[PDB]
Nucleic acid binder design. Structure first.
Ligand SMILES: [Cl-]
Ligand SMILES: [Cl-]
Ligand SMILES: [Cl-]
Ligand SMILES: [Mg+2]
Ligand SMILES: [Mg+2]
Ligand SMILES: [Mg+2]
Ligand SMILES: [Mg+2]
Ligand SMILES: [Mg+2]
Ligand SMILES: [Mg+2]
Ligand SMILES: [Mg+2]
Ligand SMILES: [Mg+2]
Ligand SMILES: [Mg+2]
Ligand SMILES: [Mg+2]
Ligand SMILES: [Mg+2]
Ligand SMILES: [Mg+2]
Ligand code: NA
Ligand code: NA
Ligand code: NA
Ligand code: NA
Ligand code: NA
Ligand code: NA
Ligand code: NA
Ligand code: NA
Ligand code: NA
Ligand code: NA
Ligand code: NA
Ligand code: NA
Ligand code: NA
Ligand code: NA
Ligand code: NA
Ligand code: NA
Ligand code: NA
Ligand code: NA
Ligand code: NA
Ligand SMILES: [Sr+2]
Ligand SMILES: [Sr+2]
Ligand SMILES: [Sr+2]
Ligand SMILES: [Sr+2]
Ligand SMILES: [Sr+2]
Ligand SMILES: [Sr+2]
Ligand SMILES: [Sr+2]
Ligand SMILES: [Sr+2]
Ligand SMILES: [Sr+2]
Ligand SMILES: [Sr+2]
Ligand SMILES: [Sr+2]
Ligand SMILES: [Sr+2]
Ligand SMILES: [Sr+2]
Ligand SMILES: [Sr+2]
Lengths: 115, 145, 246, 119
RNA sequence: UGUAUGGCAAGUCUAACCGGAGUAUCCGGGGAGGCACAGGGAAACCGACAUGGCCGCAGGGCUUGCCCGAGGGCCGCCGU
RNA sequence: UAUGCCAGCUGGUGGAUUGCUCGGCUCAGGCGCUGAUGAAGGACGUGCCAAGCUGCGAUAAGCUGUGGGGAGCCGCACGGAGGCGAAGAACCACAGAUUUCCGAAUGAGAAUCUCUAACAAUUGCUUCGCGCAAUGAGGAACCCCGAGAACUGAAACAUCUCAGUAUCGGGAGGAACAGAAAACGCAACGUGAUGUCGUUAGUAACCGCGAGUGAACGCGAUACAGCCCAAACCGAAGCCCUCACGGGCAAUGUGGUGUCAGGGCUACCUCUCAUCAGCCGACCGUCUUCACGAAGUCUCUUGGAAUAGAGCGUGAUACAGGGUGACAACCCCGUACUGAAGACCAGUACGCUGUGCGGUAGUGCCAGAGUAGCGGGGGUUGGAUAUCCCUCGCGAAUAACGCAGGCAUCGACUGCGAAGGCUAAACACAACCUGAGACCGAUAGUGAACAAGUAGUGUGAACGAACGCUGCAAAGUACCCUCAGAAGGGAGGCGAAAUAGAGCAUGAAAUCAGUUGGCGAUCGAGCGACAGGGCAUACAAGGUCCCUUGACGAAUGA
């Protein structure tokens, strides 16, 4: 039972996109978000720099934090970003909300899940 | 609805037989009783081990890895930008009540650094000197002899 | 966005940009938490006398007279919880912490979110307030803080089509239950909040259900009474500006 | 205080001089204009009109003012007993209005006319 | 010591207390100190993988079995 | 059908329930000593009629004055008779008068009385005379100094723990205690009286090294405040009593100087605004009390009664709370605003008077002994070798000296001067005042909403209940009949209501009387569940049900 109304809406929107469009990621990210908070992703920057590649969206099924350096020109999509993360990402790429990524790419194509 | 809330009418409140939840006998004694007898299990063994040195002769060093310095160099624009030069004593937090500042060598050094600190490790040098740089010891650091 | 400023006659007098905090997403769970914390922190510690029912040397006779082993004194049973005039087994204790902690960041975000709920005209109407407006919050000129008469603020709110909310709050409910005997006999709907800058509106305070506040200390309870977001508020132009850096 | 228990308590246990405020009744239109007060302490000489009880509408002279029980006896506002005797029905001054005053006292008249004080 | 929810996140939280005020609520201040941010050793003392290899779930890609494969698994290697 | 079973109806019994709150419980702020000038407490008195409570004291529910208050009053307590008040009573605030006996209890004795001048007893001063003074006892807890358990925990138990707890002895105050370093020892080129709060920390330390026990320095805060002797050198320059006279004290030293920014003496420089003594003496704030204080008691309907519904209108720096015959901002008290007084802060702060801060050189003049310290024996503590204290024995130096810095000795280094003394503020408690409440709501909450520490129990120490509600208004039931009758009953009267009629709102269950329906004197016992028949049923809140026939028709199936 998620108490946050915004997280509840996001999960509903991730499901609607997984069913209507050809997305097999948005409903998979919805399943991890429905799981307990401790099982959610708490990813730092040094991990996105290690496994992500350009022109391929990075989906984090949790929150992105600011430890480490990011050089790659990647578009990171997450539930939330720490103040420092969003700042460090926008310097060398784009920090996009998961709510936007659904409207931009409802089919969930060319996307890497990083946790 | 919680567990406690569903107990009215259960008689035993999850205790099993009504002969269970009585005194300390159900716990096998009070507190850590029988830690060497009936409840010896998962208890740290009995005995004395080692010694402690008096608190005022005990030094506390402030540590920092080369990785933490190197990851935040461009953000540390409030310091010297040489041919980068950074005094470690001004970077580390809690460095007031600490005896000395030591730089440890964990991680990579992707920049040319000139670090000034009280102490360095053998790995802190190899990684900074090997990536084109110098290690400067303070006047307090002149204890190594 | 833009917010239309009004003079003491209810006519448009320019407009200033509605601050960024009014665009914070409404988060009723956080607001409700901040109000629950505020309501509990003013609660007083109570508890029964630690010795109530224990002031007796009552002893149990034990086996022998065909009676239960209950402590008696002068043929009258005493002390034990199952006995009339006996102690209370698990009574309210004074040692109990009746206060709730809240993180400053979590509480500040609730203040901001409640301030934002003020901007949405549909939420304000959903909360219960009676008004005939599209634009909300009602923004009035700094010359409001200089009004002395209450009946003069009535005229201004009638000019602003916002008085119907006081007609809503002009009906006291005589509560059900024993709260009556303790002084909590009446209650009335929460109506308009008046946020000023220098000092709270002496002129508006006595209006039915109206609460007065200041931009430096207006809290989640003023903004969202009972945890319900979207209160029909009226700011002073400088109050609207001061409430921005909160 | 705000507490009901303490409020009713202070009224029932009020000393004799403070019980004067419990026998106060509203003045008529002409009398409010003349003395600058809304109400007055009812005296055993005044003429009064009953505004609320069963005797609502009747006028009469105030025969007795009991500070103890905080009630007044007005002329012809009576109840008939079983023996046929007419005994007075006590009235709360809150259910009554003063139409004419008794100003035989120098002090009561002086108190009523002064703008700094009230009677 | 767990768990569910929520805030912030390489950090996080203030305590006593101070100021304000609508005066027990509440707004502002207060990081003293705590826990986390490196460990091993009784101690002296010393001080680590921002990834090198192989499998491979979910997921993505493609010319539809082939690739990329976070997390995970098995190894290496590093500190003491 | 008798005795009788089950359910109901009318009426009781009972006092649950619901509603109500004059009492509690808890938190918060303020405030805080009394007593030989006889307290606190107790006894006995005191009223026109007076048993209890409250008050009061032979002047006895009260006397006097000033201020407030006001036409009424004569307590709780609504009677009768009578009285008092415009000669300003009642009532309230401050001040004063009176104030029996026992009581620390003090002339002596004594179960509240008695016998023949009384500070009894112990002290200080002393005119050596009880002449002048002090002590005694009380107080809710808090505070300080002593004495000091056991149950219990350790699953037994002895050290340990419970615990320096309970309890006991002595004592002070409005707060106590502590307190201006022979300190600390983040060892420093550092801190700078003391409490307390947060933290340091369940860390160091202790411990059948078991169970358990448990600091400090520092830091952040609160509040801040620093001084006086002894001695050196002076040597009667002095103090106390008295109006004075005069007396007493004092060379075994009153008084001056001085007190680690050591001082004194000698020699000079400069100068004070330190310090100590004393005078004056608040603001603000806080707590309590008081004065003043806006606007409807209009229409219709209902009602016993508008404070209800519908209609019209009003104030608001006041829509807190209470009262008033039902839901009241505008009927009454209050409430906002403004203003007044007292108390506390505080005889403090500020201001003033006086004194005089300080510096150089010289000088082994002065600087607290059973002490510092060592040893035997104990207690206590986290204090471990390294806590604090008691006891027995022993026992030093003299600043050119001494102590400390967590084992001893010696040297170095850093810190600091014991064995004399005083000290505001910040902190504890809750008797007392006021305020508050997601506390309880009469088997609750105090033992106590009531005669409550009452009735009552015990030789005594001590123990100890239960009892709240007529009505808008007593209108608290006249008259008549009956009766042995102020009984009770009947009839009658009041009220919206007497099934509101006196322990009188409501009025449950157990249960009782009468009565209705069903069963019933040939019949068998967990009292029922589910099926199906009889008999019984005003309305309302349920409206379905029966039979021929016909359609559909699972498994099964002639
Ligand atoms: Cl990470
Ligand atoms: Cl150690
Ligand atoms: Cl220090
Ligand atoms: Mg009880
Ligand atoms: Mg109820
Ligand atoms: Mg007047
Ligand atoms: Mg005697
Ligand atoms: Mg035992
Ligand atoms: Mg053992
Ligand atoms: Mg101990
Ligand atoms: Mg220490
Ligand atoms: Mg002197
Ligand atoms: Mg001991
Ligand atoms: Mg009781
Ligand atoms: Mg009754
Ligand atoms: Na049990
Ligand atoms: Na420090
Ligand atoms: Na008792
Ligand atoms: Na029995
Ligand atoms: Na508490
Ligand atoms: Na800190
Ligand atoms: Na029989
Ligand atoms: Na007091
Ligand atoms: Na009497
Ligand atoms: Na007296
Ligand atoms: Na004496
Ligand atoms: Na004498
Ligand atoms: Na045991
Ligand atoms: Na035994
Ligand atoms: Na032990
Ligand atoms: Na009235
Ligand atoms: Na000894
Ligand atoms: Na020392
Ligand atoms: Na009762
Ligand atoms: Sr269980
Ligand atoms: Sr037990
Ligand atoms: Sr063993
Ligand atoms: Sr620090
Ligand atoms: Sr036996
Ligand atoms: Sr009276
Ligand atoms: Sr009376
Ligand atoms: Sr914080
Ligand atoms: Sr100081
Ligand atoms: Sr000395
Ligand atoms: Sr040593
Ligand atoms: Sr006996
Ligand atoms: Sr009758
Ligand atoms: Sr068929």
């Amino acid at each position: 039972s998620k108490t946050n109304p915004r997280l509840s809406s996001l999960i509903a929107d991730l499901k609607s996109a997984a069913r209507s469009s050809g997305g097999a990621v948005w409903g998979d990210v919805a399943e991890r978000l429905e799981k307990p908070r401790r099982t959610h992703a708490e990813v730092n920057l040094g991990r996105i720099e290690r496994y992500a590649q350009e022109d391929e969206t990075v989906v984090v099924p949790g929150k992105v934090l600011g430890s480490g350096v990011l050089q790659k020109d990647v578009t990171v999509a997450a539930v939330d970003f720490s103040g420092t993360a969003e700042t460090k990402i926008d310097q060398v790429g784009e920090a996009v909300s998961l709510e936007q990524a659904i409207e931009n790419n409802p089919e969930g194509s060319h996307v890497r899940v990083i946790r | 609805t919680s567990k406690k809330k569903r107990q009215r009418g259960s008689r035993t409140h999850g205790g099993g037989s009504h002969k269970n939840r009585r005194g300390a006998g159900h716990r096998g004694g009070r507190g850590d009783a029988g830690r060497d007898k009936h409840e010896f299990h998962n208890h740290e063994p009995l005995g004395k081990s080692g010694f402690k040195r008096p608190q005022k002769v005990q030094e506390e060093a402030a540590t920092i890895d080369v990785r933490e310095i190197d990851e935040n160099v461009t953000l540390l624009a409030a310091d010297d930008v040489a041919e980068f030069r950074v005094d470690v004593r001004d970077v580390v937090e809690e460095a007031d009540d600490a005896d000395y500042v030591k730089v440890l060598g964990a991680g990579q050094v992707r920049h040319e650094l000139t670090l000034i600190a009280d102490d360095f490790s053998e790995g802190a040098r190899e990684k900074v000197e090997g990536a084109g740089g110098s290690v400067e010891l303070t006047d307090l650091g002149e204890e190594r002899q | 966005m833009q917010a239309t400023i009004y003079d003491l006659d209810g006519n448009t007098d320019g407009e200033v940009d509605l601050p960024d905090v009014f665009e914070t997403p409404v988060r009723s769970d956080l607001i409700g938490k901040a109000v629950r914390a505020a309501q509990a922190n003013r609660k007083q510690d109570y508890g029964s006398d630690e010795y109530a029912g224990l002031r007796t040397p009552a002893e149990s006779f034990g086996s022998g007279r065909g009676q239960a082993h209950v402590p008696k004194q002068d043929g009258r049973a005493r002390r034990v919880p199952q006995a009339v005039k006996g102690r209370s087994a698990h009574p309210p204790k004074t040692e109990k912490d009746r206060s709730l902690d809240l993180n400053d960041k979590e509480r500040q975000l609730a203040v901001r979110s409640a301030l934002a709920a003020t901007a949405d005209a549909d939420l304000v109407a959903d909360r219960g307030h009676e008004f005939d407006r599209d634009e909300v919050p009602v923004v009035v000129s700094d010359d409001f803080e200089d009004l002395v008469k209450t009946q003069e603020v009535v005229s201004l709110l009638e000019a602003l089509d916002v008085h119907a909310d006081i007609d809503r709050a002009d009906e006291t409910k005589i509560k059900a239950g024993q709260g009556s005997a303790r002084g909590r006999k009446y209650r009335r709907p929460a109506s308009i909040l008046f946020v000023t800058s220098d000092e709270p509106s002496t002129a508006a305070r006595n209006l039915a259900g109206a609460d007065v506040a200041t931009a430096s200390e207006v809290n989640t309870e003023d903004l969202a009474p009972g945890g319900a977001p979207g209160r029909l508020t009226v700011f002073t132009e400088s109050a609207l500006a001061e409430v921005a850096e909160r | 205080s705000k507490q009901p228990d303490k409020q009713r308590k202070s009224q029932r246990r009020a000393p004799l001089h403070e019980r004067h405020k419990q026998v106060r009744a509203t003045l008529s239109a002409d009398l409010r204009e003349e003395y600058g007060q809304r109400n007055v302490r009812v005296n055993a000489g005044d003429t009064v009109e009953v505004l609320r009880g069963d005797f609502a509408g009747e006028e009469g002279e105030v025969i007795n003012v009991d500070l103890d029980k905080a009630v007044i006896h007005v002329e012809d506002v009576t109840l008939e007993k079983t023996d046929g005797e007419e005994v007075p029905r006590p009235l709360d001054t809150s259910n009554v209005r003063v139409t004419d005053l008794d100003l035989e006292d120098e002090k009561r008249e002086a108190r009523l006319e002064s703008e700094d004080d009230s009677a």
